[PDB]
């Protein structure tokens, strides 16, 4: 009258869940007055 | 008969690596081009 021992292992990686944000990095400002054509 | 040994999964919550590192985005040029001399 004995059942088994279903000690289900864990997940070696499991829900690591990397953010996967995706690179938005946007250095996008050289807008300092670039010598405007007003001379 | 006797108990068992571990092992199971199917899909233990797939997550996905991070997206990427900050790009250069849309680097600007300047406020206005043409000349820096006095108008």
């Amino acid at each position: 009258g004995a059942p088994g021992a279903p000690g289900s292992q864990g997940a070696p990686g499991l829900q690591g869940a990397p953010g996967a944000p995706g690179s938005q990095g946007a250095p996008g400002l050289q807008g300092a007055p670039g010598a405007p054509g007003s001379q | 008969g006797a108990p068992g040994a571990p092992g199971s999964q199917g899909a233990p919550g797939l997550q996905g690596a991070p997206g990427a590192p900050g790009s250069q985005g849309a680097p600007g040029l300047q406020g206005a081009p043409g000349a820096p001399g006095s108008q």
Partner: peptide
Amino acid sequence: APGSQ
């Protein structure tokens, strides 16, 4: 540019 300098 041919000028502005």
